[PDB]
Amino acid sequence: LPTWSLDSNGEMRSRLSLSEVLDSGDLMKFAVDKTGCQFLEKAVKGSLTSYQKFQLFEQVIGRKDDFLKLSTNIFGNYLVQSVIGISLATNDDGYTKRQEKLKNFISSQMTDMCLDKFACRVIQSSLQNMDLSLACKLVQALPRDARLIAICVDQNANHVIQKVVAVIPLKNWEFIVDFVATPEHLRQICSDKYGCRVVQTIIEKLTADSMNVDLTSAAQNLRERALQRLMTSVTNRCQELATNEYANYIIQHIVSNDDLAVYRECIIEKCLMRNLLSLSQEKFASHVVEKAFLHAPLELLAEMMDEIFDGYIPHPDTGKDALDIMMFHQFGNYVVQCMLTICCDAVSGRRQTKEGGYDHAISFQDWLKKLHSRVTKERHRLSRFSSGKKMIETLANLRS
């Protein structure tokens, strides 16, 4: 940093004024230095004369190249965000030009910035602080090709998409919904550590839940359709997503949320029914099977219960059935525990048994009797395992 600003022992002077720095032409040097940038940070949080503001506007966010340089800088990016805030607060004659220029700078370099660890932070705060019409233009600058995928699955850039989803009306980012819905994109993005969070965030935004009551009816309609398009695509690839190490959380999210009930039933019918035994044996899909049991509508839950109890032919030699296999399987045991607990909740009053214009209590009692009889019969083998001991305990707790 500038020698004129240092003391005898090579350290930044203590009585340095913001104006000295602004007048010196050496701001860029301070802004990329930790000590210098922090001094600037504190200095710009206080009172500022009009000229001080004017200079900061020109030197921090007035020229494209210096703007990118600081936005991509580990320290500088904070000063950029602070100066943008001040610019937005300053309604002088230059307000409109400064804001348009900031739109242009970011837009023209949108992809480059999104992917940069530090510039993406500048993007995200700009999206929620800038006038909405200008923030909307930033969204428009997002790429529509393979770069969008990279953005969705980047550990830093994914948060730009999530911010867009949070603070920008849907119409501006509808293209992302459809982009992600493409069979090949859906596969990649959902099967990615970060991308699956992005898809979930999208689904949540598209959900007609309590958080969306402020939407106009026209906007709800826009949302309903976008949700329906994305769900169609998720449903077509339900099997692949359910068994995937990352996308299974998405299927779980849809199956678990009452506000997505219609989609819950689709998914269960499309990839779960008739596959319950095999999926209960999958590391990742076993968690989806549990969610389905927990949240299926009663009529469908009866089919699921019937599939486990009666749906499969016992082994030709040993007589082992689906229930034997699942009870002792490293992943299947959790599903059977889930079925048991559902039944105990139902007959214990902890779970509503009325639905579809009828009291299914009789059904839960039947299922429970089956499980109890199985566990009674196999108590010795079962008690060798934590899972078996848990079920035995669950049943004993029910008696009393």
Residues that bind RNA (CB under 7 A): 34, 37-38, 41, 74-75, 77-78, 81, 117-118, 120-121, 124-125, 155-156, 159, 193-194, 196-197, 200, 245-246, 248-249, 252, 283-284, 286-287, 290, 330-331, 333-335, 337, 385-387, 390
Report the C-alpha gap between 377 and 119 in whole angstroms: 64
Give the closest residue to 29 by CA, choosing from 73, 87, 62.
73
Nearer to RNA, 27 or 360 (CB): 27
CB of 240 to RNA, least distance (A): 14
Q: Which is nearer to RNA, 289 or 360 (CB)?
A: 289
Residue (of 136, 76, 137, 81) closest to 104 by Cα position: 137
Shortest spacing between CB 85 and RNA, in angstroms: 12
**Residue 214 CB, nearest approach to RNA (Å):** 24
CB of 81 to RNA, least distance (A): 6
In angstroms, rounded to a whole number, what is the distance separating the alpha carbons of residues 8 and 215?
62
Integer Cα distance of 251 and 289 in angstroms: 10
Q: Are 172 and 142 in contact (CB under 8 A)?
A: no
Q: Which is nearer to RNA, 148 or 336 (CB)?
A: 336
Based on CB atoms, which residue is closest to RNA, 55 or 201? 201
Exposure pattern of 181-198 as b/e (b: 16+ CB <10 Å)? beeebbbbbbbbebbbbb
- Shortest reach from residue 218's CB to RNA, in Å: 31
Q: Please identify, using beta-carbon distances, which residue of 39 and 173 lies nearer to RNA.
A: 39
Using the structure block, give the residue that is written with the tokens 């002792």. 328
Q: Please name which of 53, 89, 84, 52 lies closest in space to residue 71, comparing C-alpha atoms.
A: 84
Residue among 23, 28, 21, 19 at smallest CA distance from 6: 21
CB of 130 to RNA, least distance (A): 15
Q: Is residue 33 helix, strand or coil? A: coil
CB of 360 to RNA, least distance (A): 25
Q: How far apart are the first and last CA of the chain?
A: 76
How many angstroms separate the CA atoms of 288 and 290, rounded? 5
Shortest Cβ distance from residue 340 to RNA (Å)? 11
- Look at residues 199, 187, 323, 194 and name the one whose alpha carbon lies nearest to residue 243: 187
Closer residue to RNA (CB): 40 or 305: 40
Smallest distance, RNA to C-beta of residue 39, A? 10
Which DSSP string do the residues of 330-384 spell out, in sequence order? TTHHHHHHHHHHHHHHHHTTSS--EETTEETHHHHHHHHHHHHHHHHHTHHHHTT
The dihedrals phi and psi of 94, each to the nearest 5 degrees, come to -90, 0
Phi, psi dihedral angles at 355 (to 5 degrees) = -175, 155
389 phi, psi to nearest 5 deg: -55, -40
Q: Which is nearer to RNA, 328 or 363 (CB)?
A: 328
Residue 46: left (phi > 0), alpha (psi -120 to 50), or beta? Answer: beta
**Of 240 and 366, which has the nearer Cβ to RNA?**
240
Nearer to RNA, 193 or 354 (CB): 193
Tell me, what DSSP letter sits at residue 255? Answer: H
CB of 365 to RNA, least distance (A): 24
Q: Is the CB of 149 or the CB of 363 nearer to RNA?
A: 149
